[PDB]
Write a protein that binds this DNA or RNA. Sequence first.
DNA 1: ACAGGATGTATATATCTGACACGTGCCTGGAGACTAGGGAGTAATCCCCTTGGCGGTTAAAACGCGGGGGACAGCGCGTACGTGCGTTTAAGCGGTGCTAGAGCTGTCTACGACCAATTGAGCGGCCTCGGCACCGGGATTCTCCAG
DNA 2: CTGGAGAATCCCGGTGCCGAGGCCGCTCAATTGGTCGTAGACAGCTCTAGCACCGCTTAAACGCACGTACGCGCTGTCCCCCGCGTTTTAACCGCCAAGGGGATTACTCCCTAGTCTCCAGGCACGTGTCAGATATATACATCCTGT
Lengths: 148, 97, 98, 94, 94, 79, 80, 109, 109, 64, 63
Amino acid sequence: TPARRRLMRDFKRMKEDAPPGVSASPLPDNVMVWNAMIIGPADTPYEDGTFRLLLEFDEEYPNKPPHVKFLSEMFHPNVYANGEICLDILQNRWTPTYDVASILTSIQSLFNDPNPASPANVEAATLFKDHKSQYVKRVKETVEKSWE
Amino acid sequence: PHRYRPGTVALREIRRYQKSTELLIRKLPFQRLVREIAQDFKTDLRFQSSAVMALQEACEAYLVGLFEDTNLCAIHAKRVTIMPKDIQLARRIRGER
Amino acid sequence: KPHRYRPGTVALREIRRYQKSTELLIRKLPFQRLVREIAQDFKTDLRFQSSAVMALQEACEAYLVGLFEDTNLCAIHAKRVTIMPKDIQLARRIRGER
Amino acid sequence: RSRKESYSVYVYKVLKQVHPDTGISSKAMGIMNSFVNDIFERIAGEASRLAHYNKRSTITSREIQTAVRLLLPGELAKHAVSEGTKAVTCYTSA
Amino acid sequence: RSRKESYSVYVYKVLKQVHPDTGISSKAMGIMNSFVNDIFERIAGEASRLAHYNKRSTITSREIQTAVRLLLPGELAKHAVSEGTKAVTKYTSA
Amino acid sequence: RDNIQGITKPAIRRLARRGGVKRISGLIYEETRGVLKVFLENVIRDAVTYTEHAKRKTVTAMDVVYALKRQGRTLYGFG
Amino acid sequence: LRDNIQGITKPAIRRLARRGGVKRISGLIYEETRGVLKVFLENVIRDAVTYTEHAKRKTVTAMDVVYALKRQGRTLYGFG
Amino acid sequence: ARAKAKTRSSRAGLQFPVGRVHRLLRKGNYSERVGAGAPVYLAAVLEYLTAEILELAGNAARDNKKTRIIPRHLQLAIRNDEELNKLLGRVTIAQGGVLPNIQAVLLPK
Amino acid sequence: ARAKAKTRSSRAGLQFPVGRVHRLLRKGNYSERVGAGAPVYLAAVLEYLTAEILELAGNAARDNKKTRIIPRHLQLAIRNDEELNKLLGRVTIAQGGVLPNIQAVLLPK
Amino acid sequence: EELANFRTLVYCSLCSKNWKNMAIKTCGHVFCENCCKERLAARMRKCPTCNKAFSSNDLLTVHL
Amino acid sequence: ELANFRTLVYCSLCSKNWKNMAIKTCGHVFCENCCKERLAARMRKCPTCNKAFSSNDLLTVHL
DNA sequence: ACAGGATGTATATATCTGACACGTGCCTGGAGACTAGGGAGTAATCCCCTTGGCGGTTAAAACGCGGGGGACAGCGCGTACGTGCGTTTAAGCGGTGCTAGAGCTGTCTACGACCAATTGAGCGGCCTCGGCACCGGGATTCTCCAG
DNA sequence: CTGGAGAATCCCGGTGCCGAGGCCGCTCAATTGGTCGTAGACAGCTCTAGCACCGCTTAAACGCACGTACGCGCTGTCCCCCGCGTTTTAACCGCCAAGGGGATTACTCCCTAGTCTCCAGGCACGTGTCAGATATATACATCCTGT
Ligand SMILES: [Zn+2]
Ligand SMILES: [Zn+2]
Ligand SMILES: [Zn+2]
Ligand SMILES: [Zn+2]
């Protein structure tokens, strides 16, 4: 099917030209399920962290927005604690042209540049906006737990 | 003198009246018709101007839809002239007769 | 000598025969298979009550008989006795289905 | 001097959110208010029937899920369900 | 062991009051039950709409008479209104 | 009486033109003005029963809107 | 299940047309009858399954079909 | 030892239940309150309509030399009566069939 | 002295009122009880439908070189969109007119 | 590499399976009629590239 | 195929200016230089389908 | 097919105007907090009924063939409908006047909701016999071809 | 157009059977009797708006003559639908079996109705200006007759 065709294309893309600090790969027995982990981008308190994700795909990729879940705990104004991320490109702004590599680039970029206009974690937004020191301490502890 | 062949002025009228939104029936003769249709239900009723206008809008929309259907019937009968058989067929198929 | 009725006599007699009875005209088992096939497109491994399948069928012959009654009127309006696929389209468009 | 309620403010906000440099006539606002009332009544009446069929006494967001799916056709219902679900998720999260 | 209610007893009483030597099948009784339920729902829904339109909170016999006038056509409504008024008058007198 | 003749031949012709009709036979003007009065007797009869139930003497626009909605011909722009 | 629309056979469609008072029948009418029946069934079953899955049960009951038909303005008597 | 219970149906001289109709009106979410004469009026209307259809269906069954009313006779009674046909124009009756009528064009001559 | 009042519409990121919809649900005799998320969901659906119609009507108005939406543009937008045309197929729009379409048989050739 | 660039220029950036033969009257972009029509069917009236609103009548076919 | 791409990219009339202008009446695409030269030379008829075109029918195309 | 004249028809310019977009005061309906009760989510159990399978009968479906009835194209003719022009005719607009009646407020009383106790009517279960569907056989009628 | 032949339909009689009709617990739903708060009937007042009339403008309706385009009838062809007989298929019926899931009951807890207080968003009311309607002179597109 052209859906699995695209999925194989994205397999080749994320296996051969993985963007910096990120990785992704489907299961050899199911190209519809991908487990991912992202190394924290530079200039961040999130830098070099090991944030694992589970990505599950359907035949509606890339016609319908699929779901991506974190295999790591989350604490971010635009990211729910359960690993869900408040991002339109997979929630409200789904585009077929977006691929796994481009999605991961967008994800790693939002690490350096959050968008608190879309608040998913109110506590994380408050700490990031008003209590930068506490937010930095919490993010450092979270990234350490990601290493552990 | 100049003389348009039959079928051209009719096409321009179709184009003209499918582009506007005005009411095609005069106001006063329609009010008089409404007021006598309503006088066999109650005597000396009064009508709001907005009520009469809503009645006229509904009647004109209904008649325009019926004319579209009766035009389709005439075209189905390999004609271009509509005639009461076409109106009767449309009314019967839409379940009004 | 072979005996043959003129074309139209048995058609009229079977019009009378099927306008007097109340039985179901579509075969029940293939209709049920069609219903299940169509239902496969909305939810997998559904189960159907026999009364539900019978209700669907009772609805379908009633709908089709009404549509054919309108189609016959369209065909007669076109000054012919044979119903054609354009008559069904006219009937379904005037009612507001197409 | 009775006060009558309508959806004019909200329709005007949505209009300036969609087409920021477009106005609207007064008679078009009445048609939009009639549309909003008609759709509200359709959805509420269908949800009430669903609740009565299932022997429930509460109209929840699941009943409106089902009513929207029953009433709106095709992709118009697919997007409306998404918009409703996102709003409920945001409301429960905030 | 749930108990389900129907109109079979009353329909059978009316049948023996109208045609004293005529019976009815089980499938025809279900059709009559469906008819009675459908007409009940039509009249009740129309009376509810009338009461809501007139900003009332009570469904009286006047609302049901108006609903019968709106629903039933022609002479069928004229006879039904007479039957309803006679029953209400006899009930109030008894 | 005689107010059904106020629905004139040119008015019926331009209604047909908006409906998309190319030409009209002469026996249609008396057919459409009977169809129109049947429609009007159906709508006004419900509107006046709404007014009587309201115990009013005037037929309001919302009464006409309710009478039309009751026939599956809902109208936007009058309330 | 696949290709079950051909179970709606030519003689069945002919009997349905005969009950509708049709005297003579064109040969191209059968496939369109299949199409119309398929559209009608897809419209009714979609609402029936919606009612079924709103109640969170795996079985489509007769009441679901009755509600789906009543919603389309074609009330059916004799099934509850 | 208050008094012997007299039914509201028997007070109004009806066969259809008045208490059941009142209960169905009260639990149907139609209004906040229900008047006393509303169920009496509605039961009378329902009984009149039932009597009308049963009388016509009994006549139709008697015309077929039958002593039971089957759905065919109900369908014939409804579709032959002009008032009931327009009251129930959007109703399908299971096992009802259609009225036997053939267009005059299709008849031989 | 309790807390600053935040509207349920702003909490849900909507422009349509959630409180007014909840009140209309509670005063409409639709059910005995109304859930918390029902008005939020219904207001979002209403906002989406109004946004769709307003966007299409604005497109239709800009195609006519006008900056104000009149009922003609609403009618054109509704009857040109396949989904909305079936959603509002039995709706008459006052002062909306019809769409220009002439049958190909009537055109001269 | 330049061949891949011309692949991008001629083929629809969305599908990458058909030549660009369908242009947007509003923003000047061109795609294939199939992708434009399915995006319209998705009720998504925004440009894939510039995200500017558009309609069906704002779409015009192009040759070569 | 490289020559074919050169023809597709460059204007058919000029083969030196990239195709960047669309004609609403016929849907062909050419370059602004060639089309304005046609308009100024009264060459208001299409190179390919000979359809009439004017300054109003120019539509800029971007890749 | 082609060109020029005459008639609608789209376009640009200039001017009025009233309807819409905005601003302001205020009030009442939404929000916040709390309390209490029951609606429903969940778990467990029971057994009805849905699904699957197998074999035999045979009724319906499918296929083929011969033919004739109707669909469809073509052609001629005559009515009647479109077009245009001159002559009513009455619609439309404005302005004025009068008053019925819609809309609101304030009282107050009958009336329906609520609750507790009581009993009888209808529902589920359970028999039973006659209306009726079916098979066998004879009488009448409808269609069709030959006369 | 008027008669026989044959097929279908109709009419009558005998037989079984299962479904409609009647009957008995008994349980819950209808009935009866007070109590109370509020919904609606009633009376009065206001002032909006609906009805009636008159005069002038003039747009539209009406009436008539002409001609041509279209509706309609007739004729011929041929092809496609129908009636029929034969073979093939699978629908239908009866029986058996296993289990998924519909249909209850208990329990608890969390969700929502109800109430009181507060205040800000939305409604009513002014107000000015700009989008849009209107008049006029165009260049441009379109129809029609002669070529
Ligand atoms: Zn593409
Ligand atoms: Zn763009
Ligand atoms: Zn060039
Ligand atoms: Zn060209």
